Amino acid sequence: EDAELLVTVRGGRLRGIRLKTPGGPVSAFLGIPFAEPPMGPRRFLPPEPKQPWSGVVDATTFQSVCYQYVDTLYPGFEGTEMWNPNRELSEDCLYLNVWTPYPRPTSPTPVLVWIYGGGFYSGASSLDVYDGRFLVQAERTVLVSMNYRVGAFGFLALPGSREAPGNVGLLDQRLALQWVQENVAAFGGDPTSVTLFGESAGAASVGMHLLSPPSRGLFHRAVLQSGAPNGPWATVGMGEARRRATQLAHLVGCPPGGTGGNDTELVACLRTRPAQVLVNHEWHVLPQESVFRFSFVPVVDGDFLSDTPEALINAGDFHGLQVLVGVVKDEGSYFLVYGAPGFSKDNESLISRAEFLAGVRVGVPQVSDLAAEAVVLHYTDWLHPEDPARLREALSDVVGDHNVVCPVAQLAGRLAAQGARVYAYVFEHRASTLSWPLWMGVPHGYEIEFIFGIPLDPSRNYTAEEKIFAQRLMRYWANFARTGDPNEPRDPKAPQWPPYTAGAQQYVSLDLRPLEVRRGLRAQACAFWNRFLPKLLSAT
Amino acid sequence: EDAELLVTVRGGRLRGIRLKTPGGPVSAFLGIPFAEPPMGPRRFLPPEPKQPWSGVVDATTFQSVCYQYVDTLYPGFEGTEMWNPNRELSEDCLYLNVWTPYPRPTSPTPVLVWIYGGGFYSGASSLDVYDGRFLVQAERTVLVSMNYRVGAFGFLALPGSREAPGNVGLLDQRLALQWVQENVAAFGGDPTSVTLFGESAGAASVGMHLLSPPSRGLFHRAVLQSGAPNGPWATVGMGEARRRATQLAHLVGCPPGGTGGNDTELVACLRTRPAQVLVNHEWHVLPQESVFRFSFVPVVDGDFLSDTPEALINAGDFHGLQVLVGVVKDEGSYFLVYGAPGFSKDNESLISRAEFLAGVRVGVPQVSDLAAEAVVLHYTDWLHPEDPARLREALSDVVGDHNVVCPVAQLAGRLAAQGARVYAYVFEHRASTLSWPLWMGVPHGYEIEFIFGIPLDPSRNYTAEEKIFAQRLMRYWANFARTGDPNEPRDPKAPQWPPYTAGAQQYVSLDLRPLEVRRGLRAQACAFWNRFLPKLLSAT
Numbered sequence A, B: 001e002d003a004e005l006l007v008t009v010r011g012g013r014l015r016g017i018r019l020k021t022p023g024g025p026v027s028a029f030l031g032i033p034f035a036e037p038p039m040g041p042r043r044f045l046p047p048e049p050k051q052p053w054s055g056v057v058d059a060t061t062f063q064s065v066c067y068q069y070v071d072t073l074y075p076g077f078e079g080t081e082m083w084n085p086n087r088e089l090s091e092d093c094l095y096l097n098v099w100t101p102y103p104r105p106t107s108p109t110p111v112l113v114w115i116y117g118g119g120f121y122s123g124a125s126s127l128d129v130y131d132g133r134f135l136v137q138a139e140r141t142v143l144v145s146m147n148y149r150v151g152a153f154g155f156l157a158l159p160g161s162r163e164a165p166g167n168v169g170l171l172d173q174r175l176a177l178q179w180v181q182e183n184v185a186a187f188g189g190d191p192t193s194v195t196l197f198g199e200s201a202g203a204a205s206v207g208m209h210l211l212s213p214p215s216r217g218l219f220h221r222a223v224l225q226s227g228a229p230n231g232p233w234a235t236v237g238m239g240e241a242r243r244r245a246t247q248l249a250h251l252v253g254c255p256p257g258g259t260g261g262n263d264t265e266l267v268a269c270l271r272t273r274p275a276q277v278l279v280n281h282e283w284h285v286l287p288q289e290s291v292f293r294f295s296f297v298p299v300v301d302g303d304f305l306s307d308t309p310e311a312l313i314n315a316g317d318f319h320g321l322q323v324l325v326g327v328v329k330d331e332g333s334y335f336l337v338y339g340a341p342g343f344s345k346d347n348e349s350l351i352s353r354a355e356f357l358a359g360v361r362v363g364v365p366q367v368s369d370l371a372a373e374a375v376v377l378h379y380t381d382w383l384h385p386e387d388p389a390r391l392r393e394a395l396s397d398v399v400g401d402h403n404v405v406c407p408v409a410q411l412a413g414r415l416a417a418q419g420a421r422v423y424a425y426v427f428e429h430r431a432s433t434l435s436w437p438l439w440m441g442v443p444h445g446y447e448i449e450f451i452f453g454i455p456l457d458p459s460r461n462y463t464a465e466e467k468i469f470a471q472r473l474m475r476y477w478a479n480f481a482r483t484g485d486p487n488e489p490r491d492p493k494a495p496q497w498p499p500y501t502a503g504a505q506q507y508v509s510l511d512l513r514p515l516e517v518r519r520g521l522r523a524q525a526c527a528f529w530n531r532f533l534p535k536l537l538s539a540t
């Protein structure tokens, strides 16, 4: 039994821990170092592989969370605290976790690699909602999740320089993927069947690995949940990245008045500042007030991304690839209480017409006044142009379509039309234990707990129907990891899940009811964002 | 008997004719001269009142149709021939007609005054579909209709000149309205209860009389059917009117060659030309290929209209005015076989996507490429962007909303929100005898025969339900003429017709089925035409 907790990898030996589930035990190896601690002169630098170690590295608990901003707008509120760090913050944070079935698989098993979201400024693999013990037990797969540097530590970019090239957080994920290739077999996992899946910025990170050649060889399938690399928030230009990095330096006293200028002196001054000092000024460098916008994100500089995600998606050859994409029913709802006027999570947020018009400029920042009018045209119900409830749902749709649904829809249609086999879904079940207000419906990120089988946790208060619903979702994700097809391999009685095509645009609804096939991922609204609005911006 | 076929008016004595209907006889006085013949030096000039005459003028048949283009694209086809002139063409055409009940009313009776449409280039009061014998018999009202000069003879304008001031066709209508005030009492009509009604350009004419001070005092209620004065086709600017008048002069050899070209010499040369020669070159002066655009239309010059109809509608106080407005179910359908590529009345007109994109430029002429993209964005169904039947219906909606529905919807909203009581309808019954193809549905102008009680004609082959339906509509129109309210004077048993307001935007469906209340006259589409598109053209 406890001999299963002893595994040797290329770096050395490891001791794991045995976790309990209602259906049996699993073996987890939490806190495996896959990189040298990116500290001191290594801040902002690409990761280096962890040197081999003597003795047995204890891997029985999660390691430290990378330095990140902490949401403190609602102390003690479950809806926000569940995403906050549950371990101490540290720059020594490049650790990964491996869950493997008990008994250990004797034949190679497909591997699921999780990349957490959080706007590229937050997140951790140690969060309770990312506990992979239920997915591994119920579906007999191998699950891996890694920590990657977020915020300035992972994505501050002075493009062209060696001291801070940017995208090192994406290189942290890649190094963890190279680690899975070289070591996941020691846990019973098949390195020839690796499926990346992520949510929010983790879904965008997956898409960027699909578009980066050095990462394409490290996995074979991809799942993008509520995120895409082509969104208006997932990338930033070289000129803007340099300005955001320079503004952060000025706010922390870099350069010292007034000797300084070039990137070497600026980064050297940044590396002497305490990590928390850099965190405390992260939101100051945004150009205007907004929601769903983040300071330090992947930068398009020609290295990791040789072109914009849109350019690479349009010019890509995706034959032989299987992708699973999807969104939740209410992508933009929770963001509204983070900047839109008239919005509060503790009332009904029945905004006025004036508040809706001002909120459009917050949910769609830096666009012209004419473009904002075009947004108001599409999302105003002109039969009830001042109904507060409709204006509330309209602004949520504005933020959700512009940031998630339509970037995902453009990616899915392009992938399916250029070789890849695509499966699309819309998650429509609102968890019974959801602490956010009812009007938010199914907010961004609240399909994850069902994908990871959290309702099976006996200490939670989920319903019996939600546990069955979670098992069906884990079966979908595991079938896709095993064979590239979420449908049961040889089950005709259950309703079937058809692939997504650019012409039929078919997707399924994931809720307590059986599968239901629908068409169009908000085709009318996404024609405005993906087709017309760029023409409106170019002409003006 | 025959004593009621003799009537004296201010100009002299008249002999009418007894017309027969299935319900009873009617006295008709057809072809009453209300103006001096606008011939010779009177061409392009405002009309003079008809001088008194000796003896008895025979008013037993319709007079000559004003010179106009004749639709010869489908010889013998009922759908086009029914609008073509059924009398000789002549510039001596300023005559009107009076239908009065039998026996002649003893107390003053509400008067209906019909103004025919025809794009201001065609039409006549003598058309079979405008026969007022059934409306006068069934509802015992006095019905009047007049001829007005159309085309260049009524609306050629060299603005600022005394020889061709323009809008003389509208002045022909005004003179007929003055004639009704001075003479309709001799027929039993009440000059204090005059309800104007017209269709298409006639409806646009009614709207311009509402916005002209000298005409507003000549009537008390208005019915605008499938037309508005604020449409993109109903008016023209001074500069464009001068260009079209000068182009027409050039096509007929004016100026001769070697002489000046001022307005006095140019109009004098136009007066020497035969009338048919001017008609033959009317279509050769439009700026480009289009549909629902007409060469010589009312001009905005500060005289008849002190400003644009849109400006006057906005700044207008309409308290005390009752208006009935409406449209047919498929306004733009028939126009498509007159210019849009791929369309034919003798097939299904299942156009391709390429033909739809080109047809938008024909249906919406003189707009920028970016504006056309906005039209294509709104009217494309992006779940079926290339379905031929949907594209055919979409281009019909493009032409109909742009030219009729949204101009009418804006007028009705501004009238209601500024003092007037407005009633709105949508005519959704396709006549059983309709010769146009089925895909055209209920084309522009095919509610008129039901308003005039034409199905009651026993020589026609309408169904028994259509006869009952025509009696409902004649009751609606007559009630509105009598009381300003289309609802019965007292009948809560039958479904009611709620007034149109800018907020609720309620209208009724006119078809074989009882009244059904609906909300919004293409509110989403008309928000694009009336609100957004002007902002798009202004910022380009």
Ligand SMILES: Nc1c2ccccc2[nH+]c2ccccc12
Pocket (backbone or CB within 6 Å): A079, A080, A083, A117, A118, A119, A123, A199, A200, A334, A443, A444, A445, A446
């Ligand atoms: N910080 C948050 C998230 C971070 C990563 C992924 C999903 C998330 N959803 C959230 C939903 C509401 C509030 C905060 C959220």
Ligand SMILES: Nc1c2ccccc2[nH+]c2ccccc12
Pocket (backbone or CB within 6 Å): B079, B080, B083, B117, B118, B119, B123, B199, B200, B334, B443, B444, B445, B446
């Ligand atoms: N010349 C026409 C019209 C003229 C005046 C009013 C309505 C009309 N509808 C028509 C419908 C089809 C063809 C010609 C038409």
